[PDB]
């Protein structure tokens, strides 16, 4: 009891990916290497980790995380199974490209609206004719794979009814919605 | 399926390259390098030695192991003195059989 | 279980409670500091010259025997009074323990 | 329907009472009962409600 | 539990621990070394000799005296070893076979520090800055835990776990 | 760790013992077969194997 | 009294240890690796804050205002800039276990202001 | 013997806001079995039955 477990329906486990495209992007995006910094820079910078290696520091972690997410949502140099966690209080950005992470797809919310729109459903309803697929839905930046370690940082609507205006607002800054 | 496909496509080759080349010396000395894997489709060899493609239901009925032969390119170089070396490449040396996951990319 | 009026009056029950429960100096100490305070006549802590001089302007102990290192412990009122404990008793326990 | 309405009213009241106790804790108006840490008094009171 | 990105070796685990005038001393359990080493000796063996240069890897804001007070017992303990060669000798005296010459003990200590300690940070030469920063981060995390400023990790939390599937198992 | 050592002079195994004279900050290693002895300064971190290593180093330093 | 810091030798960056100038009765800070010495500016050598009274407002950082998982309020406006919205949260450091005291941080960009009511 | 723990950082589930000590967050199921549980009530009731 409890020791043997079974996957949830939409759970996917990462197969693993090489980190070098991300290290190459980070060095081209104002990350400073440990061998170059002075230690006095570390107190107000953010530590960047990739697969647990502390690779550098960065001085504006919000714009970095926005850029990294914008890459992942575009099928760019960051593949969909890469986790990217900002610990705001600790000043750590941790990026994971390793195998064996358990993850699941979530819908992206921006400004309290789903990015999923009628034109997506209307394309999916003729999937057998138009060859539009789940992969196109991920490539459009509508669905995102989120790991348990990244869920700590996510704000989840249980349904789009949580996104509506209410007589008292519990939360007004949701990042994702359950399918 | 994806985990098995990553094992066949990437991990076996990495393991074969990551192993150190092996040096032998009595003086004349030899070193061998393992450089490239190949995996066929599942095949079975009958008592006459002829290969044929084994389907999974034959493996279930005859109690066979559904597996494919793995090959590696091996280079041997011979060393002693004067750079009087030579290399022999023993291409596709049969190294063993790998059990194949059904419906994987390497299944029939 | 308590005898007598200590079984009815909560204040006497609390007095026995203080008589049983173990209290070390840590339970009643707010902070501790170590100073180089080489002359009690001109204590490097400013806030306490008014009382310190009263102890040294009398003959019972000799500044020539005083080590220049001071241990200063600050207690707090709530934990002392919750225990009806006095600094005269704390000093008595110190001198009982170290002579 | 009467029973369901009275149940819903009782739940709504209990939730408002928990909100009140939370506000008293946040404002430090909540005073520790003896022998209990403030966290344990808060937990005791919410579980009571 | 350090593992190199390609599995050329199995994982190697490094422990940095705080022991239960008396003060809180921090020690490292390094692989292939028979005894726990004071962390400041490990930093000197990595070539960081002055106390300030070591603390610059462990305490990123110096205006935080509560952390300084907590590293101070370890600077005290290791003060008898002050040069990189003495620290590499100290480490190499342990784990190495007792009879080997000084050069072999130094070389053994360097080999452990390059290849066996924190192989995920690097197994190359000239990686000592990377290793000093990560080992400093390990000590910093331990200090934040001891000061109660960061919560202890949960072994049940599924972010801290991995599922080995058929591929990795084979 | 091992606390008994092979003598560098007489090659007898487990023939050398270390005496840690902490109060004088000095360590003596002595071979029971040949009674060759060596003294080195010791710290509180110092241990028998550090004294033995100091002795082997002093021997190789004398071979120069 | 506040914790007493480390201080470092100018000549060799090892930490200085306090010692008295016995024949002169003044407090030195002296190196154990080299002959450097300095006169102490603070006569306190040790402080033990047994009550561990520490101000969480020093530990809070303004970046926390960016966290989408924190609650937001308009009822407690920022005194430093008048901005209507703030995040709020409880104290995070342990041993201060009892208090449910809220801390507020302004959400206006570059107003890293933090307070308690 | 205690309300549902913060197994996520200061949260029981990523659906709640941090430091939500309120009844729904910490696992008060306000529905009946005839009304049927909401998804968070369902998962907290599974935590209890386990
Ligand atoms: Zn001998
Ligand atoms: Zn110095
Ligand atoms: Zn403001």
Swiss-Prot record, chain G:
It is found in: Nucleus, Nucleolus. Pfam families: Zn_ribbon_RPB9, Zn_ribbon_TFIIS. It comes from the Eukaryota. Component of the RNA polymerase II (Pol II) complex consisting of 12 subunits. InterPro entries: DNA-dir_RNA_pol-M_15_CS (IPR019761), Rpa12/Rpb9/Rpc10/TFS (IPR012164), Zn_ribbon_RPB9 (IPR001529), Zn_ribbon_RPB9_C (IPR034012), Znf_TFIIS (IPR001222). It comes from Sus scrofa (Pig). A zinc finger (TFIIS-type) spans 74-116. Keywords: Acetylation, DNA-directed RNA polymerase, Metal-binding, Nucleus, Transcription, Zinc, Zinc-finger. Its main location: nucleus. GO terms for biological process: maintenance of transcriptional fidelity during transcription elongation by RNA polymerase II; transcription by RNA polymerase II; transcription initiation at RNA polymerase II promoter; transcription-coupled nucleotide-excision repair. This is DNA-directed RNA polymerase II subunit RPB9. One of its GO terms (molecular function) is DNA-directed RNA polymerase activity. A zinc finger (C4-type) spans 9-34. The gene is POLR2I. Zn(2+) 1 binds at residues 9, 12, 31, 34.
């Amino acid at each position: 009891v409890g020791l043997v477990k079974n996957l949830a329906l939409m759970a996917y486990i990462s197969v693993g990916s090489q980190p070098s495209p991300i290290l190459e992007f980070l060095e081209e995006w104002s990350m400073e290497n440990l061998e170059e910094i002075s230690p006095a820079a570390i107190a107000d910078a953010t530590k960047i980790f990739v697969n647990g290696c502390w690779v550098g520091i960065h001085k504006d972690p919000e714009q970095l995380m926005n850029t990294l997410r914008k890459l992942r949502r575009q099928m760019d140099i960051i593949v969909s199974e890469v986790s990217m966690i900002r610990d705001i209080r600790e000043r750590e950005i941790r990026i994971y490209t390793d195998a064996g992470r358990i993850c699941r797809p979530l819908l992206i919310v921006e400004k309290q609206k789903l990015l999923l729109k009628k034109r997506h459903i209307d394309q999916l309803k003729e999937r057998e004719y138009n060859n539009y697929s789940w992969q196109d839905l991920v490539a459009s930046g509508v669905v995102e794979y989120i790991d348990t370690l990244e869920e700590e940082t996510v704000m989840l609507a249980m349904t789009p009814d949580d996104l509506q205006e209410k007589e008292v607002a519990y939360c007004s800054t949701y990042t994702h919605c359950e399918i | 399926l994806d985990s098995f496909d990553e094992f066949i496509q990437m991990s076996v080759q990495r393991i074969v390259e990551d192993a150190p080349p092996i040096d032998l010396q009595a003086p004349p000395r030899y070193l061998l390098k393992f450089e490239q894997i190949y995996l066929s489709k599942p095949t079975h060899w009958e008592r006459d030695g002829a290969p044929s493609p084994m389907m999974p239901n034959e493996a279930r009925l005859r109690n066979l192991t559904y597996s494919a032969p793995l090959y590696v390119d091996i280079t041997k170089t011979v060393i002693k003195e004067g750079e009087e070396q030579l290399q022999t490449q023993h291409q596709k040396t049969f190294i063993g059989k790998i059990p194949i996951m059904l419906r994987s990319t390497y299944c029939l | 279980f308590l005898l007598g009026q200590s079984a009815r009056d909560a204040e006497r029950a609390k007095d026995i409670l203080c008589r049983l429960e173990h209290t070390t100096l840590r339970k009643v100490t707010a902070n501790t500091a170590i100073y180089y305070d080489p002359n009690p006549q001109s204590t490097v802590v400013a806030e306490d010259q008014e009382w310190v001089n009263v102890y040294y302007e009398m003959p019972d102990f000799d500044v020539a025997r005083i080590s220049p290192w001071l241990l200063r412990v600050e207690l707090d009122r709530k934990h002392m009074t919750d225990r009806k404990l006095t600094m005269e008793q704390i000093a008595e326990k110190i001198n009982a323990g170290f002579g | 329907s009467k029973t369901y309405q009275d149940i819903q009213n009782t739940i709504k009241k209990a939730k408002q009472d928990v909100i009140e106790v939370i506000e008293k804790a946040h404002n430090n108006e909540l005073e520790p009962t003896p022998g209990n840490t403030l966290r344990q008094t808060f937990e005791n009171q919410v579980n009571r409600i | 539990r350090s593992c190199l990105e390609n599995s050329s070796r199995p994982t190697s685990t490094i422990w940095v621990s705080m022991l239960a005038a008396i003060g809180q001393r921090i020690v490292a359990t390094l692989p292939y070394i028979k005894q726990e080493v004071p962390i400041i000796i490990v930093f000197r063996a990595l070539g960081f000799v002055s106390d300030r240069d070591i603390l610059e890897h462990i305490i990123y804001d110096f205006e935080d005296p509560e952390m300084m007070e907590m590293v101070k017992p370890s600077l005290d303990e290791a003060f008898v070893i002050q040069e990189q060669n003495v620290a590499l000798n100290f480490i190499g005296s342990r784990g190495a076979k007792p009879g080997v010459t000084k050069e072999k003990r130094i070389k053994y200590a360097k080999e452990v520090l390059q290849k066996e300690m924190l192989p995920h940070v690097g197994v190359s030469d000239f990686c000592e800055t990377k290793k000093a920063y990560f080992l400093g981060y390990m000590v910093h995390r331990l200090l934040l835990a001891a000061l109660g400023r960061r919560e202890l990790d949960d072994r049940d939390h599924y972010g801290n776990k991995r599922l080995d599937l058929a591929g990795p198992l084979l | 760790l091992e606390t008994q050592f092979t003598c560098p002079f007489c090659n007898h195994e487990k023939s050398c013992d270390v005496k840690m004279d902490r109060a004088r900050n000095t360590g003596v290693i002595s071979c029971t077969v040949c009674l060759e002895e060596f003294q080195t300064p010791i710290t509180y971190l110092s241990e028998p194997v550090d004294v033995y290593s100091d002795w082997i180093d002093a021997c190789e330093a004398a071979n120069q | 009294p506040g914790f007493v810091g480390i201080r470092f030798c100018q000549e060799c960056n090892n930490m200085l240890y306090p010692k008295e100038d016995k024949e002169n009765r003044i407090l030195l800070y002296a190196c154990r690796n080299c002959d450097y010495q300095q006169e102490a500016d603070n006569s306190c050598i040790y402080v033990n804050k047994i009550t561990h009274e520490v101000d969480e407002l020093t530990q809070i950082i303004a970046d926390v205002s960016q966290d989408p998982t924190l609650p937001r309020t308009e009822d407690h406006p920022c005194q430093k800039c008048g901005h209507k919205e703030a995040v709020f949260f409880q104290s995070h450091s342990a041993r201060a276990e009892d208090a449910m005291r809220l801390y507020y941080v302004c959400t206006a960009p570059h107003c890293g202001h933090r307070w308690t009511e | 013997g205690k309300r549902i723990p913060f197994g996520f950082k200061h949260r029981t589930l990523p659906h709640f806001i941090k430091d939500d000590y309120g009844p729904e967050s910490r696992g008060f199921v306000e529905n009946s079995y005839l009304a049927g549980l909401t998804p968070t009530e369902f998962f907290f009731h599974a935590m209890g039955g386990r």
